[PDB]
Design a protein around this nucleic acid. Structure first.
Ligand SMILES: [Zn+2]
Length: 252
DNA sequence: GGTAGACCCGGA
DNA sequence: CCGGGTCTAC
């Protein structure tokens, strides 16, 4: 899921788990667990804790328990569900948190690509994977001035800059391409070549792009089809080792 | 500071 | 053999 879908998951999942107490944690693919390094320690430590909250940072979910925070990334195919311990698990279920009321929070992932880390709540923000994560794109902490500062100092393309998780949290390939299109900026432009006007416009479109979705695509996956604004065929290239989609007329 | 390997596997 | 995102390794 992209950032807006992760926000919907956070909002939806919270009431289904808040106040519930963990009675067991079952792990069917231990490699998902990244901290503690031993999946047996991960499971042991969570037993007896109650779910108190659920927050999001970038595309990470942060489950707040009594003492610990569980930081979860679903990547593109991970999914959570709350369901009865009496019913058979869905295929590709890798981790299950069993609650004392006979319900479960289940993590499933055909790609087995997701990650979980657990630390004391107070340590979570300064440890991987949240350490160094940039500001929320919808926060005042993400500003044209913050963007301008990072752009001036780099040799990289503007696409590469926006894909850097330390610049802004949870902007992936799709919203990077879409934001650049809406701002009229070619993805392969060096970040340091953008004018002040271009940085301001890009910031505005990034916020609009994420903001509207959290509440139709112009270029992403649309190569060969006409631009929705000028009718020019959308093109696809490689920029910063990613599939990159753009209108060669609208973007400069 | 900036690139690359490592995770993962359904479908081309 | 490719795709994604985000960490660890050069
Ligand atoms: Zn166009």
């Amino acid at each position: 899921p992209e950032l807006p879908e992760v926000e919907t998951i956070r909002r939806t999942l919270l009431p289904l788990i808040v106040g519930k107490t963990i009675e067991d944690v079952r792990i069917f693919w231990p490699n998902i667990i990244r901290h503690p390094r031993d999946s047996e320690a991960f499971a042991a430590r969570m037993i007896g804790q109650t779910v108190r909250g659920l927050e999001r940072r970038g595309k990470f979910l942060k489950f707040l328990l009594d003492r610990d925070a569980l930081i979860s990334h679903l990547r593109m195919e991970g999914r959570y569900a709350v369901a009865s311990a009496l019913e058979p698990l869905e295929p590709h279920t890798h981790v299950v948190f069993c609650f004392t009321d006979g319900s479960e929070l289940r993590y499933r992932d055909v790609r087995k690509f997701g990650t979980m880390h657990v630390y004391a709540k107070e340590e979570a923000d300064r440890r991987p994977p949240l350490a160094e994560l940039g500001p929320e794109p919808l926060s005042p902490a993400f500003s044209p001035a913050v963007l301008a500062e990072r752009a001036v100092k780099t040799k990289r393309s503007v696409k590469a800059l926006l894909l850097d998780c330390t610049v802004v949290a949870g902007f992936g390939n799709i919203y990077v391409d879409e934001s650049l299109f809406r701002a009229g900026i070619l993805p392969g432009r060096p970040a340091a070549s953008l004018s002040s006007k271009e940085i301001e416009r890009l910031h505005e479109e990034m916020v609009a792009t994420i903001g509207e979705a959290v509440m139709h695509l112009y270029v992403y996956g649309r190569q060969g089809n006409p631009c929705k604004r000028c009718g020019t065929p959308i093109e696809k290239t490689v920029v910063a080792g990613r599939g990159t989609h753009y209108c060669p007329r609208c973007q400069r």
